[PDB]
């Protein structure tokens, strides 16, 4: 895509009274938004080429 540099992304789960500490002096791609895991349940990532059908 025109770019010859690379970006490497990382993730972690931050537990409810824990804290995450970033220290950087460059090349940092900073978080702005994070995601609260509100509902854990049984779900899935279905690999399919199709789209919605408005049915149930």
């Amino acid at each position, epitope marked *: 895509n025109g770019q010859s540099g690379r970006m490497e992304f990382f993730w972690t789960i931050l537990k409810p009274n824990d804290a995450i500490n970033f220290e950087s002096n460059g090349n940092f791609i900073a978080p702005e938004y994070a995601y609260k895991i*509100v509902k854990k349940g049984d779900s899935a990532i279905m690999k399919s080429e199709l789209e*919605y059908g*408005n*049915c*149930n």
Partner: antibody
Amino acid sequence: EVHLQQSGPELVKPGASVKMSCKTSGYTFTEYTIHWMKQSHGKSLEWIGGIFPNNGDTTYNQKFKVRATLTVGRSSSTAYMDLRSLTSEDSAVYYCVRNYGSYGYFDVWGAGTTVTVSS
Amino acid sequence: DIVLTQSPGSLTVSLGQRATISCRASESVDNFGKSFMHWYQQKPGQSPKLLIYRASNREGIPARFNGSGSGTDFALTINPVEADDVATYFCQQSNEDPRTFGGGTKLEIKR
């Protein structure tokens, strides 16, 4: 973004007919059913109908079955509603709304085309 | 038709307190184990806004809104009440066509 741009406020002689339009933008027209809601000035919301773009299937309320007609222009990415032979009753605001998934919630509501029926 | 009746009709609550708006369904709105109730907010002079889907989960909506309830009766709880909460609130069921809404409840701030 999920913007729904709809028609401009309108005036109709009693007995005539209106055709307000709602132009979809920002998502895939053909994946969600579009619906219409009528709000009697500062009172209560009434459900009119729904239409699924991809094949044009319609779903109406008892109340509006007759007077209303949902249609869709797929190339245009546009949903239309048509109200035939109006009365003072129909003078209110009409919202073009995208419903998510028969058992679904209306997540993106359009601006509101406001119709005025007077001679 | 599943007649939805909200109560009370108008509610005036002091700033920084708790607004508690109720909904009551003529028949249940509650199968598959989930409640198919929805709360909507109409700030004056603009179209309604989606707050809660299936009676409990928030849609960019602040936590001050507590969706609660099951079966025949539910409740939208706004607490703490802020300034920009003047609106009329609507509950609407999706359990069974024809989609029906509540009368709506208008909220006023005591200052």
